[PDB]
Amino acid sequence: AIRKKLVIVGDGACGKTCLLIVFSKDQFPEVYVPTVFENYVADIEVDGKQVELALWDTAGQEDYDRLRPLSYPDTDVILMCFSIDSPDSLENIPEKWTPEVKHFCPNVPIILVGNKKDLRNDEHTRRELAKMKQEPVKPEEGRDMANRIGAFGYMECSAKTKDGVREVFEMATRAALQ
Amino acid sequence: SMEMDEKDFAADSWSLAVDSSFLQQHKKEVMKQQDVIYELIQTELHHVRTLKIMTRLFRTGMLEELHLEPGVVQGLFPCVDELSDIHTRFLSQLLERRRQALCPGSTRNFVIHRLGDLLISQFSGPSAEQMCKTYSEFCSRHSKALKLYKELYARDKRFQQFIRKVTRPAVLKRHGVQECILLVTQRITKYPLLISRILQHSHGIEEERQDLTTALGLVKELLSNVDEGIYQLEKGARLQEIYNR
Ligand SMILES: CNC(=O)c1cccc2cc[nH]c12
Ligand SMILES: CNC(=O)c1cccc2cc[nH]c12
Ligand SMILES: CNC(=O)c1cccc2cc[nH]c12
């Protein structure tokens, strides 16, 4: 097996920690959802190729501009996350997260991931967002942002139901192998 | 880690660690508070373990088996003895607070009601100054350590055999040299996340809510000072590239 490294980036409320936890355990924890994620090395076989994929979170490093880049050396694939229940997290993608990743990870494929897709048809979410003249992120809005920033691709998932989670990490592995 | 502490922190949560008859005696809010305190101690036990792999398995093994040029092992593992001293002491304090809280006749049933004071002590005074000085040095030497590792692995056959040998066991799967260095650098930014969630469930006692609020403030001040004190060292960097930073 070949070793590859994945780093997930995005705002504090984007769901990146939950996404790594659910994938690494293959389950949404029923008793306790951990606050933090240390690291993990997933055994993944995609399109006949065996890879050891090391997983890293940047949660907690958002306000520390000199500590945060230390997570980037030798990254093979970036997952750039936003939350579908937060159009504000999508807005910070092109002029905050994107130039940073392009500087420290030149030529590394970026996959733009819309997390919490289960909240797109949640009445409580739609009511809270309507108070700030907002609505859940539309699938075309996610695709257009991914197109704009030069992302390798656009994907959606729900850590809560696990839908789309395996497909995100299998595609990230394929991107890391190119 | 030692077997006694590994077994005490084997369960996925505090609610699964204690006996069910003991869990049933507490309110939901106390269980939520204890689950996060348990996660803080469990991750501190693993962080000390990462430091022992670095000092004992890698560093000492290279000194005792390989013929590396002087100053090469220090370059691969900067400040590891100092970091091990800070965290082993902090872990000792957390584990003694848990031990004093155990019910008589039990080695697993406890409730920690007063964490805030311990966190204020760790993140203030000389221990905070030592943590700030050590992480500012470690994090400024992080990129150099990774590049030195990659150079040695690519060009030294005996170094490559040593690494492949000691990292072959499945219990070392997440703990190769580069993975340990990033695990240590990332440890300090996990503290505010853990402290904020403990604070969310510690409103029942006003003195505890105030103590955790003070501790959260101190950890953030330490992180800001460390972040402002970092500048990556690079082997063979010329003075002109440094003063034109
Ligand atoms: C170009 N030098 C830089 O240091 C840099 C550039 C872009 C984003 C970030 C975030 C931290 N540093 C950054
Ligand atoms: C500043 N650039 C853009 O806004 C952009 C670029 C590429 C595709 C789309 C779709 C919508 N906007 C796009
Ligand atoms: C970091 N501060 C927090 O309050 C927090 C963190 C992670 C999960 C939950 C669930 C409730 N609060 C949480």
Swiss-Prot record, chain A:
Q: How is its activity regulated?
A: Regulated by guanine nucleotide exchange factors (GEFs) which promote the exchange of bound GDP for free GTP, GTPase activating proteins (GAPs) which increase the GTP hydrolysis activity and GDP dissociation inhibitors which inhibit the dissociation of the nucleotide from the GTPase. Activated by GEFs such as ARHGEF2, ARHGEF3, ARHGEF28 and BCR. Inhibited by GAPs such as ARHGAP30. Inhibited by GDP dissociation inhibitors such as ARHGDIA.
> Which residues of this chain are annotated as glycosylation sites?
32, 35
Q: Residues bearing (Microbial infection) O-AMP-tyrosine?
A: 32
State its location(s).
Cell membrane; Cytoplasm, Cytoskeleton; Cleavage furrow; Cytoplasm, Cell cortex
Write out the catalysed reaction: GTP + H2O = GDP + phosphate + H(+)
Does Coiled coil show up as a keyword for this record? no
Q: Could you confirm whether the keyword DNA-binding appears in this record?
A: no
Which stretches are annotated as coiled coil? none
Impact after mutating residue 35 to A? Abolished monoglucosylation by C.difficile toxin TcdA. Abolished O-GlcNAcylation by C.novyi toxin TcdA
What cofactor is this protein dependent on?
Mg(2+)
Indicate where the modification (Microbial infection) ADP-ribosylasparagine is found in the sequence.
Answer: 39
Which terms does the UniProt entry file under GO BP?
actin cytoskeleton organization; alpha-beta T cell lineage commitment; androgen receptor signaling pathway; angiotensin-mediated vasoconstriction involved in regulation of systemic arterial blood pressure; aortic valve formation; apical junction assembly; apolipoprotein A-I-mediated signaling pathway; beta selection
Q: Quaternary arrangement and interactors, per the entry?
A: Interacts with ARHGEF28. Interacts (via GTP-bound form) with RIPOR1 (via N-terminus); this interaction links RHOA to STK24 and STK26 kinases. Interacts with RIPOR2 (via active GTP- or inactive GDP-bound forms) isoform 1 and isoform 2; these interactions are direct, block the loading of GTP to RHOA and decrease upon chemokine CCL19 stimulation in primary T lymphocytes. Binds PRKCL1, ROCK1 and ROCK2. Interacts with ARHGEF2, ARHGEF3, NET1 and RTKN. Interacts with PLCE1 and AKAP13. Interacts with DIAPH1. Interacts (in the constitutively activated, GTP-bound form) with DGKQ.
NCBIfam families linked to this entry: small_GTP
Q: What is known of its domains?
A: (Microbial infection) The basic-rich region is essential for yopT recognition and cleavage.
Q: Know the name of this protein?
A: Transforming protein RhoA
Q: Which gene encodes it?
A: RHOA
UniProtKB/Swiss-Prot annotation, chain B:
Instruction: Describe the location of the DH domain by residue ranges.
Output: 32-229
* Cysteines joined through disulfide linkages: none
Where does the record say this protein resides? Cytoplasm, Cytoskeleton; Cytoplasm; Cell junction, Tight junction; Golgi apparatus
Give the highest taxon in the source lineage.
Eukaryota
Q: How is it modified after translation?
A: Phosphorylated by AURKA and CDK1 during mitosis, which negatively regulates its activity. Phosphorylation by MAPK1 or MAPK3 increases nucleotide exchange activity. Phosphorylation by PAK4 releases GEF-H1 from the microtubules. Phosphorylated on serine, threonine and tyrosine residues in a RIPK2-dependent manner.
Subunit comment: Found in a complex composed at least of ARHGEF2, NOD2 and RIPK2. Interacts with RIPK2; the interaction mediates tyrosine phosphorylation of RIPK2 by Src kinase CSK. Interacts with RIPK1 and RIPK3. Interacts with the kinases PAK4, AURKA and MAPK1. Interacts with RHOA and RAC1. Interacts with NOD1. Interacts (via the N-terminal zinc finger) with CAPN6 (via domain II). Interacts with DYNLT1.
The linked condition is: Neurodevelopmental disorder with midbrain and hindbrain malformations: An autosomal recessive neurodevelopmental disorder characterized by intellectual disability, speech delay, mild microcephaly, midbrain-hindbrain malformations, and variable dysmorphic features.
| Description of its domains | The DH (DBL-homology) domain interacts with and promotes loading of GTP on RhoA. Promotes tyrosine phosphorylation of RIPK2.
Q: What is this protein called?
A: Rho guanine nucleotide exchange factor 2
User: What is the species listed in this Swiss-Prot or TrEMBL entry?
Assistant: Homo sapiens (Human)
Gene name, per UniProt, is: ARHGEF2
Q: Which residues of the full protein are shown?
A: 206 to 448 of 986
